[PDB]
From TrEMBL, chain A:
Protein name, per record: Vp2
Species this protein is from: Banna virus
Residues shown, of full length: 353 to 403 of 955
From TrEMBL, chain B:
Native species: Banna virus
Pfam family, one: Seadorna_Vp10
InterPro entries noted in UniProt: Seadorna_Vp10
The protein's name in its UniProt record: VP10
Superkingdom, natural source: Viruses
From TrEMBL, chain C:
Superkingdom, natural source: Viruses
Protein known as: Vp2
Amino acid sequence: YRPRRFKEIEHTHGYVYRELNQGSLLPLVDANLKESSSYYFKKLMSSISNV
Amino acid sequence: MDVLSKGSLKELLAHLEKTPLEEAISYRIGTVPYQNVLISRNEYYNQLYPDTTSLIDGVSREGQRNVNGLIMSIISYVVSGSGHYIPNIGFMLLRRSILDILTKHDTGLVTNNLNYGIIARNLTVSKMNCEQRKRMLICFKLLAYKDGNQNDYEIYLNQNIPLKQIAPNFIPGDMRTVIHNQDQLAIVGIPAYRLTQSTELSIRDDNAKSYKLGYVDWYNSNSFLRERSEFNLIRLKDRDTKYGKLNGW
Amino acid sequence: TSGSIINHANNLNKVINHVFADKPLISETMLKILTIDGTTGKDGYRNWLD
């Protein structure tokens, strides 16, 4: 991927409002394993089938 | 040149972790350290210019084969960019990093008998500038923590008033102290003033200006790494990370 | 006494235009320097006043 060139003002005075905490998806996956696995496998299968 | 460019405690310790001891040691014969000599400075004077050579010059000198010479070669590399001539140290010691020698007992080198006052005097601490003294004090603190000589380090600072004011603040075992530290340790860098291709009178000043002018060329060279434009091409192992921790810290 | 640095420099250029309306070269040359300086932002405007 080609790197993005930020303006000189943004490098010196640039600020971003970002929430950087990462929440685990394990509570959904561990409780519902059959439903979570079937949903993601189906979505992945549709994409790979068109290669 | 690369060691002189580091401007923060985190960068300096990170460089020392990846740099082996063989970079500190030089394989050029050099000359004996303390001599009154006459050098040629034709830009200023027609007559020869007296000066005294020293171990913190940028040119390699001959060094003692003892452990004292090895530590004195490490510090001269950090503060001047070049080390001294101590051959036949051995493969086992030379392959270790500079930080491992200064901080780890597993290297097999014993340094608890070292005297900080004698080492400082042999390195001509009086001739050092503020950044050079701060860098040497970092080396002393790492050695003191390795040998359990923290009390001796503090007393040596109490005897030397100017050294206490500029002493860097970090615990050699905690990484949180290194990240917080904001001391500027750069010796070479991009100059805000006018830098010209002119000679300097003394050996130390002339050799320092060579690194300063070389760093400018290195900065615009293809060997320099531009984080802003080529961050994705860097390998993940050596890519810059906010949560960068030295091993064991 | 009041106003931002950008407003201070921009309004000064307008006054230069009014005072030196007979000689338009002064404002054009003054605005040439500001265009290059102002790309940095507020820091560039400070350099123009310096």
